[PDB]
Amino acid sequence: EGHSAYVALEQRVNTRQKGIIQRHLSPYDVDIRGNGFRQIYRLGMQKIRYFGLIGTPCLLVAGAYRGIWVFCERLEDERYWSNAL
Amino acid sequence: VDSHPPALPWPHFQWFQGLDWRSVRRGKEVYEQVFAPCHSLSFIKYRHFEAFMSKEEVKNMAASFEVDDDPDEKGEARKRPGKRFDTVVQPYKNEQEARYANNGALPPDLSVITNARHGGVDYIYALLTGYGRPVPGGVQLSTTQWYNPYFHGGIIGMPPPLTDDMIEYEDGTPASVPQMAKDVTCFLEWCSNPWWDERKLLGYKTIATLAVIAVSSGYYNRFLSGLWRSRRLAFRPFNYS
Amino acid sequence: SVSELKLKFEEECAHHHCHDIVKKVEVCEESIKGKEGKNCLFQHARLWECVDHCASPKVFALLK
Amino acid sequence: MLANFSRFFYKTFLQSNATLIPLTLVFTYXXXXXXXXXXXXXXXXXXXXXXXXXXXXXXXXXXXXXXXXX
Amino acid sequence: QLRPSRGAYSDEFVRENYIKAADPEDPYNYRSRAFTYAAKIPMWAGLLAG
Amino acid sequence: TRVTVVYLMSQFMPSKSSLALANIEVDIGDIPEGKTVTIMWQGKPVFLRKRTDAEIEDMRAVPMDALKDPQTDEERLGEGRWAVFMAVCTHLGCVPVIDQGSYNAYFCPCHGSHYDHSGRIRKGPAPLNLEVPPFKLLDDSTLFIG
Amino acid sequence: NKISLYRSYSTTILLSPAYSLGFCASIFIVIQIISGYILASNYIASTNESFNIIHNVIMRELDTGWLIRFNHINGCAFLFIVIYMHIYRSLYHNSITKTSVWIVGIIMYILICGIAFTGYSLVYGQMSLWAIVVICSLVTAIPFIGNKLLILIWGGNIVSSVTLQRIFCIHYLLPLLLILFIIIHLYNLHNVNSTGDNYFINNRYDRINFYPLLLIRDVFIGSNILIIYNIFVYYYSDLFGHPDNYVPANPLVTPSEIMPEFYLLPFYALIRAIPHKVLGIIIMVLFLLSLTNLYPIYFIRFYNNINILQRSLLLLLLLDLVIASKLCLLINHYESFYLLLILSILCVLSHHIYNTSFNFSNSI
Amino acid sequence: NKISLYRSYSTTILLSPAYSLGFCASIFIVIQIISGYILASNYIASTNESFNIIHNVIMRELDTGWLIRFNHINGCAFLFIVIYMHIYRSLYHNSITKTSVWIVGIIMYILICGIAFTGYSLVYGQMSLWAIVVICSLVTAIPFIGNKLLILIWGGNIVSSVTLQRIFCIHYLLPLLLILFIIIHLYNLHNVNSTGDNYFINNRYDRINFYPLLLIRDVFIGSNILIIYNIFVYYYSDLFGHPDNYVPANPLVTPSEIMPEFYLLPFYALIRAIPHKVLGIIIMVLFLLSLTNLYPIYFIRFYNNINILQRSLLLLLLLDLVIASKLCLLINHYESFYLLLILSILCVLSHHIYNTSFNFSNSI
Numbered sequence A: 001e002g003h004s005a006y007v008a009l010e011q012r013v014n015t016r017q018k019g020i021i022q023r024h025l026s027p028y029d030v031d032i033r034g035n036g037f038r039q040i041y042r043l044g045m046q047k048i049r050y051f052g053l054i055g056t057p058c059l060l061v062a063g064a065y066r067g068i069w070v071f072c073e074r075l076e077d078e079r080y081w082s083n084a085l
Numbered sequence B: 001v002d003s004h005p006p007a008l009p010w011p012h013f014q015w016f017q018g019l020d021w022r023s024v025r026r027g028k029e030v031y032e033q034v035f036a037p038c039h040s041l042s043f044i045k046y047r048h049f050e051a052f053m054s055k056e057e058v059k060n061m062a063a064s065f066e067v068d069d070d071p072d073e074k075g076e077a078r079k080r081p082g083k084r085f086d087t088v089v090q091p092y093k094n095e096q097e098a099r100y101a102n103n104g105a106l107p108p109d110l111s112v113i114t115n116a117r118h119g120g121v122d123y124i125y126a127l128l129t130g131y132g133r134p135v136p137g138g139v140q141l142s143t144t145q146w147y148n149p150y151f152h153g154g155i156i157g158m159p160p161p162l163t164d165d166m167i168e169y170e171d172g173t174p175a176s177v178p179q180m181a182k183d184v185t186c187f188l189e190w191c192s193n194p195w196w197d198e199r200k201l202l203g204y205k206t207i208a209t210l211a212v213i214a215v216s217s218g219y220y221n222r223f224l225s226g227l228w229r230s231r232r233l234a235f236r237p238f239n240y241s
Numbered sequence C: 001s002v003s004e005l006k007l008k009f010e011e012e013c014a015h016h017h018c019h020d021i022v023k024k025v026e027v028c029e030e031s032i033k034g035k036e037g038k039n040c041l042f043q044h045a046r047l048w049e050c051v052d053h054c055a056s057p058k059v060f061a062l063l064k
Numbered sequence D: 001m002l003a004n005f006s007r008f009f010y011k012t013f014l015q016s017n018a019t020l021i022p023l024t025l026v027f028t029y030x031x032x033x034x035x036x037x038x039x040x041x042x043x044x045x046x047x048x049x050x051x052x053x054x055x056x057x058x059x060x061x062x063x064x065x066x067x068x069x070x
Numbered sequence E: 001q002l003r004p005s006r007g008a009y010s011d012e013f014v015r016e017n018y019i020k021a022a023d024p025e026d027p028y029n030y031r032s033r034a035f036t037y038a039a040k041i042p043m044w045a046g047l048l049a050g
Numbered sequence F: 001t002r003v004t005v006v007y008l009m010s011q012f013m014p015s016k017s018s019l020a021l022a023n024i025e026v027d028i029g030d031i032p033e034g035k036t037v038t039i040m041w042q043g044k045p046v047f048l049r050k051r052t053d054a055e056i057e058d059m060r061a062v063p064m065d066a067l068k069d070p071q072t073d074e075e076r077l078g079e080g081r082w083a084v085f086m087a088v089c090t091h092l093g094c095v096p097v098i099d100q101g102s103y104n105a106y107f108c109p110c111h112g113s114h115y116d117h118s119g120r121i122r123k124g125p126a127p128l129n130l131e132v133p134p135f136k137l138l139d140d141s142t143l144f145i146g
Numbered sequence G, H: 001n002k003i004s005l006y007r008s009y010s011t012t013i014l015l016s017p018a019y020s021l022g023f024c025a026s027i028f029i030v031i032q033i034i035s036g037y038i039l040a041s042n043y044i045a046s047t048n049e050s051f052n053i054i055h056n057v058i059m060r061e062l063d064t065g066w067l068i069r070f071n072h073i074n075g076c077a078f079l080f081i082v083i084y085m086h087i088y089r090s091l092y093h094n095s096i097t098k099t100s101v102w103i104v105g106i107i108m109y110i111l112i113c114g115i116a117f118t119g120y121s122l123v124y125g126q127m128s129l130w131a132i133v134v135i136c137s138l139v140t141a142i143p144f145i146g147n148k149l150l151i152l153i154w155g156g157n158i159v160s161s162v163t164l165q166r167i168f169c170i171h172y173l174l175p176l177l178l179i180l181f182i183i184i185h186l187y188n189l190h191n192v193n194s195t196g197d198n199y200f201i202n203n204r205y206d207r208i209n210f211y212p213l214l215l216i217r218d219v220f221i222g223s224n225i226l227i228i229y230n231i232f233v234y235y236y237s238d239l240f241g242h243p244d245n246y247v248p249a250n251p252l253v254t255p256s257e258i259m260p261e262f263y264l265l266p267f268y269a270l271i272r273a274i275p276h277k278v279l280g281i282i283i284m285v286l287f288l289l290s291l292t293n294l295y296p297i298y299f300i301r302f303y304n305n306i307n308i309l310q311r312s313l314l315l316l317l318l319l320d321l322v323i324a325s326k327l328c329l330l331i332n333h334y335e336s337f338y339l340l341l342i343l344s345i346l347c348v349l350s351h352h353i354y355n356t357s358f359n360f361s362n363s364i
Ligand SMILES: CCCCCCCCCCCCCCCCCC(=O)OC[C@H](COP(=O)([O-])OCC[N+](C)(C)C)OC(=O)CCCCCCCCCCCCCCCCC
Pocket: F008, F009, F012, G107, G111, G117, G118, G121, G132, G135, G136, G152, G153, G154, G163, G166, G167, G170, G173, G177, H033, H034, H037, H038
């Protein structure tokens, strides 16, 4: 791990770290249900908003393609029903 | 394009349910008495019938036919009554012969037929109960051609194979055209997939076991993530004016 | 027998659920009269696809 | 909750692999291989019993005997 | 807010949302150890059978 | 290295036996005009017809649009007097029988396909025309199919 | 030293469950390798015995030879599904910055397409034979040395037993090279580490040990995806296939519609949307070569971040690929769908994966 | 940086031409891989049409399929000759000190023996069938599972096409594992370097660049070895084989003498010199396991020098092995040679490769 590209990068870029205090609890003292429903709600809402954002162009283009698909499908149905093939 | 077969509720297309085996028995009867001389089952052996038939019945059925044997002591050819391990009898010697007995058409092998056609079982049913319809205008039918809307192109070289009261079922069920079509379709479904019930059963067992593993491993993953999901950070401030 | 019931169901379904298809196939039958190399295979296939959607299941329920 | 029972259960079975491994083997056999597997097998056999291969064979032998008496 | 002094969660929050409820009769987490190992057992059993 | 690469590659070239069945030569003098003869080549049956002038005129009168698969006599069948075809119906598999067709030409009775003396499909479910092998006109007493 | 085992490799904490797709693909590679080795032990490659030895020996003489075959088929299909999800995630999170990992991945993708095609060729059925014929007809369009080349590929003017035997050897050989490339893939990744949901440069105090947390997450996600996989093996065994492959090959008859497997359809579209055969070949080669990142080499190039517009365009690319596949299958009967087929293909060919910083510069 | 290429790895100047045996072995591995891949692309494994397609289709229909087959046979023979010389050299210069290199080498030797056996089985001739029968009968002596295991291995009570197909798949697979183990062999060697004629601890000023001097020496020695190898491919093409293998196998008829290939004879001797079957199997396993150096594991051990006495005993080992092979094949007609066969086997089993410093110590 010490001879890895990401370790080399962190040594080149980051300074010698100082003044950082981390606190960790053992999993036997942490409840798996502790922050469950709140996180479910928050993440669901976030993903709903984000997909509503980034999905709009796809929705618009899919609507245009659906219009074209309907037109072509009924054109070909009319062609087949009149022996015009 | 040709007619799309309707989707029918088959007993083996149901929840927690497998082949009927009564339809399979009756379809075996119809196979023996109707299309044994025309179509072939290259993949089915007599011992395969020891699934809905008794051992002695299978033995007698096998002995009812004749099979090639090793050449005589002088090299002469021989015949021999069949056994359990012999494949069922072929109806024709070679393709040419077949084509000669069917006015140029070649009846295909029906060993995997339900797997070889789009919407298999339904299609076969729709093929057999579709023969009497009026011929469309502008279509010229030879003396050995018939109009079946489900065949590719609408014209088929197979004469209507099923007629009412053609076969006397052992269990007493009336042998109408739809009934016989249903029975042969079930029998051919068994021929194509003789592993239906074992496949469904193994599916249930595997899904249940994987579900147990998934629940336990999901709990353990959530437990191990607790160490990091609750981590806390603090930065000692600088001295700013 | 079940065959008579099958024919009855086919007639009912054709005249109650595929009436427009019946009218269309009758229209196309007139068109091809005289024309060379034209057939009503496609229209009749559509008709018998529409009819068997309703007629076929019912018969399939009347047999063991 | 169940502090005393938790201590007892941990000290008895879970503290040592000499007992946890036999415990998990017992769970594998008596609660997965003969409880889910065999149970689903029995359930499948029970639901589909009027159409069973055994049933078909029995009825067949009966009818064959009945026909042989004529 | 551009000179950080803390991570995402404040101590109070963690004391109310992640730390288990204390059991004064069980100060050594025997309950948690027992439950976790027992709930691991099914995974091992399924993997062995498979 | 050059010869070794050539040699390893030559291990994947066609086998001598497949090169013995590649080409055949069929005597053509014995066939009079207005006769269709069936032979066997590569397993595939082959129809050889000593086409006459009437067929040439009739097929030249055929436009290039009424054909499901648009081809012309010179486009597909250079030999004016000889028609060489692969006797296999394009739609499914059947052997078109001699004559008995609505065009006084090849007829597939399995489902009723009609191929003119040019081998071009006119009626029926066949999507294409009869395959024309890359036959070559050898001396006036033989024809080299291959 | 268990501690030394824990700390031998550390990753970021932002590995959402979407980062187990590599492990799922590994599971399916293992399944394919094992099933294929079992099948090959019962397989004879020839035009007189191949189709028969699959449907009359493998699936009816063994206890669960049918199960092995269904595993092989549906495992191929699900391997392709998981690989497509893997690629889509890599594009979504701007993982092209992992240059070694990306190049090795593209090589593996091309190799897997080849493996799937050659394997599908081994069932000497109607679809297998005629797919071989169509692809080789693509081959013979090469200028000058095309026809001879085709002969060398087939060992004759038609597909025959020697063709099946060489295809079998290729199908056996390639997956093992794929295994080696997977090893290289993982080696490069462990050299550069994983992106995570967001890209950060972390010191050891911000990273976590890979073992055993991520192995347990991989087991959990793998069990779920195996449930989904086995639902298809036992109840939809033939959903990812065409029934015409259950008809033994007939060189004298062509099927009504020749269609490849769902995971190769996009490539097929690129051939149907380009009328000129040579132009189609060239465009396919350029497409495959352009998926890589082998140019520039000695010009300074670096990678910037990705944004919402780019993510939305990625979704559009997915839509266009799906539409192109469906339409390229539909154009056989209906000729008015050429418009939408060509439109979707052109839209696919004009999708930006890497935002060229060279877009903006000044003239002399 | 061409200079960096020269200095990437350096070795000792005392590399006599005897240190090209590894390179020659790699040459014959490459030849075997290529010729075997070409053969396998024309091969059908089945008792009905195996012997026929080797002798009637591969050899007589291809342009130089005969040359491919002869290359393959004589390449196996020469690969074993070179490996035996390689092992003899490594024992002569006390190369057991390269612990990792030696262990990987022994694993590779076992793999190659298996590859040779499974390959010889594929020619469904008299010798192949009955060698399989004898070996699998030796399998039948295992306590409490000999018949269950034998049935599992053969797929039945008799060798058949399924057995041929298993053997074909294993023969195809194993050489690729062999290539991986060769890569590991060379990796370890580069880690610990070579011994040379004598062992010295040299600084960089006493070592030479490996490239291109030793590459050119390898080319020269390989050229000479290939001349010698081709003198057999073209003029003695069946010197190492047995004519009974040019007879299609009859399961009903047993050959007069069942003799394996000349590179397995020593093992065969161990079987013939031990009347009890279980004891023979145990001795075989112990022999193969004692060739390795996996014990002691945590006890302190180190290797001292080698001397003239050890080299003389090494010559004696060679003599005993050769005589044992010849006698093992002779004893089928001449019963009095059992004495000399047993004597040679006993002399072989008591040969000291590693002189253990534990031979000298005191008591509590
Ligand atoms: C860092 C990597 C960068 C990218 C490069 C690596 C990409 C991954 C590997 C690409 C494929 C390599 C294939 C090598 C195998 C030989 C190919 C071959 O000859 O195919 C015959 C194929 C046979 O054709 P085919 O039928 O297989 O082609 C498929 C055709 N259809 C469309 C029908 C499916 O080609 C030929 O026969 C043409 C002449 C070949 C001449 C050379 C023969 C070589 C014989 C020795 C091979 C030794 C292989 C084992 C050793 C190496 C592996 C350990």
